[PDB]
Amino acid sequence: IGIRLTLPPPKVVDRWNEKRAMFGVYDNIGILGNFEKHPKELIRGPIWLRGWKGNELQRCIRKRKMVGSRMFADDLHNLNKRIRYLYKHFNRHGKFR
Amino acid sequence: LRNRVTDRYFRIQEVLKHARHFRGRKNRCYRLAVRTVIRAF
């Protein structure tokens, strides 16, 4: 019977955590900080998708051409195969054309 | 699994409560009970 017999331990959430209370600060650092920075400079993550949105084929092409030189070898090989599959899928298979 | 189904016991019990007087495994097993409960309705 895939259901639990006891109620789970309670989930305490501090809404006035340091992350939650100061969340979203310096999102308008461009429009009222004399445009010295863009808010896409305010995001932190992978270096190939700071300030950029694409689908998966675009994320993997951009990932390869930006950081693909210093990727690990079977990560580079798996990523080449993913680009080759997603090429063959997006460009040849699908309903709408 | 990011979000897999937790509430599934109650869907099985939505169907199976109408089967509680059937014969065989129709009162017990969900695969058989859906057909006989649809058919009874």
Partner: peptide, 26 residues
């Protein structure tokens, strides 16, 4: 172990209802 609270709560209440209909209180 499926994360969540609501199926555990509803199933906790139906275990309470079966505990009532098994041993009815005076």
């Amino acid at each position: 172990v499926k994360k969540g609270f609501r199926a555990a709560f509803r199933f906790q209440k139906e275990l309470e209802r079966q505990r009532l209909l098994r041993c009815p209180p005076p």
